Amino acid sequence: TVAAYNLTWKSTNFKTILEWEPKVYTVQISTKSGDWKSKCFYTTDTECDLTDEIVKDVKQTYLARVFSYPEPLYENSPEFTPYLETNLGQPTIQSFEQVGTKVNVTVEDERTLVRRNNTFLSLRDVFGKDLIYTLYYWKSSGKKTAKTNTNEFLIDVDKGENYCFSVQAVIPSRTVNRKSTDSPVECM
Amino acid sequence: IVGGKVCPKGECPWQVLLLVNGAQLCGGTLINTIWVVSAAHCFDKIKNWRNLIAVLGEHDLSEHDGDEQSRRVAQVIIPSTYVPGTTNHDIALLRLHQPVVLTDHVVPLCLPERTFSERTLAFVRFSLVSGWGQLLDRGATALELMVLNVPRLMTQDCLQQSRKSPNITEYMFCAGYSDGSKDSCKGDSGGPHATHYRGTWYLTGIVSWGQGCATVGHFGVYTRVSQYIEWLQKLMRSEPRPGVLLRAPFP
Amino acid sequence: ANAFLEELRPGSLERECKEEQCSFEEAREIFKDAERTKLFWISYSDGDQCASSPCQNGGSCKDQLQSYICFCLPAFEGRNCETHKDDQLICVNENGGCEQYCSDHTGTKRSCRCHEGYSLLADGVSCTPTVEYPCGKIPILE
Numbered sequence: 038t039v040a041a042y043n044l045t046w047k048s049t050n051f052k053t054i055l056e057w058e059p060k061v062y063t064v065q066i067s068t069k070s071g072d073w074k075s076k077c078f079y080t081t082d083t084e085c086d087l088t089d090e091i092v093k094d095v096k097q098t099y100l101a102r103v104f105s106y107p108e109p110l111y112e113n114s115p116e117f118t119p120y121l122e123t124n125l126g127q128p129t130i131q132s133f134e135q136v137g138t139k140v141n142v143t144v145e146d147e148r149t150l151v152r153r154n155n156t157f158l159s160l161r162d163v164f165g166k167d168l169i170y171t172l173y174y175w176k177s178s179g180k181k182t183a184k185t186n187t188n189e190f191l192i193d194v195d196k197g198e199n200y201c202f203s204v205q206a207v208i209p210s211r212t213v214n215r216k217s218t219d220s221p222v223e224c225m
Numbered sequence: 226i227v228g229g230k231v232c233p234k235g236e237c238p239w240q241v242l243l244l245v246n247g248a249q250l251c252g253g254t255l256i257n258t259i260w261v262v263s264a265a266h267c268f269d270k271i272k273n274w275r276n277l278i279a280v281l282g283e284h285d286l287s288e289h290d291g292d293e294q295s296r297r298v299a300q301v302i303i304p305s306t307y308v309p310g311t312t313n314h315d316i317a318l319l320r321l322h323q324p325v326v327l328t329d330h331v332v333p334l335c336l337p338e339r340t341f342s343e344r345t346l347a348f349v350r351f352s353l354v355s356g357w358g359q360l361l362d363r364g365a366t367a368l369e370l371m372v373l374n375v376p377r378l379m380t381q382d383c384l385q386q387s388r389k390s391p392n393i394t395e396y397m398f399c400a401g402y403s404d405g406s407k408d409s410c411k412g413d414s415g416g417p418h419a420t421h422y423r424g425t426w427y428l429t430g431i432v433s434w435g436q437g438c439a440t441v442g443h444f445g446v447y448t449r450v451s452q453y454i455e456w457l458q459k460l461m462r463s464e465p466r467p468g469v470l471l472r473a474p475f476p
Numbered sequence: 477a478n479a480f481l482e483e484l485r486p487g488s489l490e491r492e493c494k495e496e497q498c499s500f501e502e503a504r505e506i507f508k509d510a511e512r513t514k515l516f517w518i519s520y521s522d523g524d525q526c527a528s529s530p531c532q533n534g535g536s537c538k539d540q541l542q543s544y545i546c547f548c549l550p551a552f553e554g555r556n557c558e559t560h561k562d563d564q565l566i567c568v569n570e571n572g573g574c575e576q577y578c579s580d581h582t583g584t585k586r587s588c589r590c591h592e593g594y595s596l597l598a599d600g601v602s603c604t605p606t607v608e609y610p611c612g613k614i615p616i617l618e
């Protein structure tokens with residue numbers, strides 16, 4: 038038997054899967070002062086979904102460790118704090134209405150794996166003021182940008198000419214993984 | 226105990242005080258009315274074997290009250306693999322001459338089954354350690370029973386997180402802090418490392434050894450009781466052998 | 477796409493990429509700028525990873541860039557919701573839900589036991605004291 042290695046967290050919108058090498062195991066997860074909880078019992082996969090455990094408290098810092106079978110051989114994963122590290126998914130532009138010289142661009146309040154009651158909380162529900170959206174639009178050869186604290190943009194448009202838009206979900210306070218990928222392009 | 230607090234009178238009912246010739250010697254843990262589990266090294270220098278006393282329901286060693294019960298230790302059983310002056314197999318099973326009376330201040334700690342202790346208790350992060358040991362590494366002992374909550378570590382982590390000494394065997398496990406703030410200490414030897422699970426406390430460890438007390442870069446080490454459950458149970462069902470000290474094979 | 481003589485018409489994203497599948501050149505012929513065509517092309521050409529319907533047991537798939545995310549129903553977990561939460565009743569998993577002792581049994585379900593001084597309740601998981609001073613309980617706190 039050999040101890041797992043290269044343990045990595047793969048997390049987006051809080052769907053959190055622990056992965057490792059090489060390609061029978063059992064995983065345990067915990068917070069620095071909580072009990073250890075076993076997961077993915079005697080799985081032969083080199084991955085383990087831990088979403089249900091981490092969404093109980095996304096502000097918490099978890100540690101996981103993969104046990105190996107043919108005390109047991111094991112390896113610790115890097116510490117993981119969902120709220121500060123889960124990757125923001127690719128955003129989507131939900132709509133854009135024009136009203137004369139202005140245009141409203143709305144970003145879809147995407148759902149996350151975080152459950153509250155019989156429902157899934159949105160990206161807004163979870164980060165509140167911590168999340169902003171960035172807009173990159175063009176017509177002309179230059180680009181323009183606008184930022185917003187909600188899920189909507191209100192910008193000025195030169196009548197007649199055609200505009201294209203793209204948005205990015207951003208969490209500015211963040212150090213790493215602070216921006217989502219660019220959304221699909223959308224034009225008038 | 227370094228960095229802990231007074232255990233409120235009655236909230237550490239299985240704690241035992243061991244005295245030789247009337248002097249404080251070590252701690253122990255009651256597990257039923259006639260048996261006490263302690264640490265084998267507590268007996269490396271005993272000469273008057275007829276002078277061991279176990280006191281239950283003790284709390285403040287400067288006052289006497291009706292909750293205290295004393296019993297001569299009729300027998301001290303140690304694994305025949307234990308070597309005085311060394312760390313491995315640090316455990317001893319003591320038979321009291323007369324059973325103690327169970328009261329609100331004197332209650333036995335549960336000896337768990339081996340697998341439950343290995344697969345479940347071993348992963349409850351915190352457990353309590355207690356005793357009348359030194360309050361500081363250099364210092365004197367405590368007058369009131371002191372208790373301290375300590376987190377457990379798997380051995381691979383203990384070693385990785387410690388400075389470069391006896392080896393941590395499979396018959397041991399580390400618990401505590403390496404920042405130099407909390408640990409049990411020498412005089413706590415033989416006392417309980419008790420784990421709380423779903424409404425019940427179980428014996429998972431015995432205060433055993435460590436580098437100094439609450440030394441930076443080190444953790445306390447405790448006898449891993451789960452490895453001795455069968456040993457303790459076979460002995461508890463055995464007939465009383467002549468002589469105080471007995472060495473029983475282990476396994 | 478291009479049909480006979482359609483390319484005589486100026487580029488139109490709707491007609492060519494929405495109402496039709498457009499290649500990269502047709503797309504470039506629309507946005508003209510390279511950095512703009514790439515921004516559009518990265519999503520347009522990604523593909524919908526959810527197509528294969530990977531989420532199981534009634535999960536909901538949400539497409540991403542070269543990947544997907546499965547949202548599962550309460551009783552399920554896993555990248556693809558393939559894990560049944562109600563099928564983890566073993567001793568290693570939270571002590572089989574037993575208050576004290578847990579015994580696995582190959583094939584059947586796990587059984588729970590209790591330490592001397594206690595007795596297993598009719599719920600099959602709980603233990604209750606049969607003596608006045610059972611081990612592990614602190615009288616003054618009870």
Ligand SMILES: COc1cc(CNc2ccc(C(=N)N)cc2)c(NS(C)(=O)=O)cc1OCc1ccccc1
Pocket residue numbers: 266311312315390391408409410411412413414432433434435436437438439444445446
């Ligand atoms: C059973 O073995 C030992 C017990 C005790 C005394 N008992 C005791 C109990 C608990 C702790 C503690 N948790 N910090 C610390 C100490 C001691 N310490 S002493 C010399 O002051 O009495 C040493 C022991 O092993 C030899 C050894 C040598 C070098 C380094 C470590 C250990």
Ligand SMILES: *[C@@H]1O[C@H](CO)[C@@H](O)[C@H](O)[C@H]1O
Pocket residue numbers: 524525526527528529530543544
């Ligand atoms: C469904 O499609 C996805 C995306 O490529 C694939 O990775 C799955 O394994 C398949 O079931």
Ligand SMILES: *[C@@H]1O[C@@H](C)[C@@H](O)[C@@H](O)[C@@H]1O
Pocket residue numbers: 534535536537547548549
């Ligand atoms: C998508 O989400 C999952 C959780 C279930 O609610 C499905 O019924 C729905 O389509």
Ligand SMILES: C[As](C)(=O)[O-]
Pocket residue numbers: 383384387388390393399434435436442443444445446
């Ligand atoms: C008792 As140690 C291995 O922490 O020095």
Ligand SMILES: [Ca+2]
Pocket residue numbers: 283284285286287288289290293
């Ligand atoms: Ca007293």
Ligand SMILES: [Ca+2]
Pocket residue numbers: 477478479482483492502
């Ligand atoms: Ca065309």
Ligand SMILES: [Ca+2]
Pocket residue numbers: 477478479482491492496
């Ligand atoms: Ca065409």
Ligand SMILES: [Ca+2]
Pocket residue numbers: 491495496
């Ligand atoms: Ca057409």
Ligand SMILES: [Ca+2]
Pocket residue numbers: 490491494495
């Ligand atoms: Ca159309």
Ligand SMILES: [Ca+2]
Pocket residue numbers: 501502505
């Ligand atoms: Ca062309």
Ligand SMILES: [Ca+2]
Pocket residue numbers: 483486487488502505
């Ligand atoms: Ca064209």
Ligand SMILES: [Ca+2]
Pocket residue numbers: 478483501502505
């Ligand atoms: Ca063309």
Ligand SMILES: [Ca+2]
Pocket residue numbers: 522523524525539540541542543
């Ligand atoms: Ca896609």
